[PDB]
């Protein structure tokens, strides 16, 4: 149950920067075992690859597996990913500074994104720190 680089290259066939996107995706899924690459229709408009799953976020002495979806545009890594928190039936989205009504994530890291200094490993690192202070979702009481 693991994705081969070959399968990843096929998923980004229509991408403008393929090797770069594959390279970073491999890095991300290797370090974050709970994120999985999936080719899906973005908003039912067009196919793009995204990293789906959870990232470990420590909050008040406990670690939570926050559900997220990182959409890699066909311009990745030159343009930042479009990121969303994805609440399950047992939780709700906490709208605030870094999360809007739709669960879309907003971070300075994304706003000033610039290749090659900016990357997914850096972005996820930021999310763990930022969400650790302000969770993007909470379990339903």
């Amino acid at each position: 149950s693991a994705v081969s680089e070959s399968q990843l290259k096929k998923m980004v066939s229509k991408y403008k920067y393929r090797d770069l996107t594959v390279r970073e995706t491999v890095n991300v899924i290797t370090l974050y075992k709970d994120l999985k690459p999936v080719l899906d229709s973005y908003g039912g408009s067009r196919e793009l690859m995204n990293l789906t799953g959870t990232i470990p976020v420590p909050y008040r002495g406990n670690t939570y597996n926050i559900p997220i979806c990182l959409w890699l545009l066909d311009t990745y890594p030159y343009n930042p990913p479009i990121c969303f928190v994805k609440p399950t039936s047992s939780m709700t989205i906490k709208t605030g500074k870094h999360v809007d009504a739709n669960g879309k994530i907003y971070l300075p890291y994304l706003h000033e994104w610039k290749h090659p200094q900016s990357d997914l490993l850096g972005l996820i690192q930021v999310m763990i720190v930022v969400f650790g202070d302000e969770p993007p979702v909470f379990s339903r009481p």
Partner: peptide, 9 residues
Amino acid sequence: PEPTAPPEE
């Protein structure tokens, strides 16, 4: 890992 979130505060 199974999606988890902190209790509402």
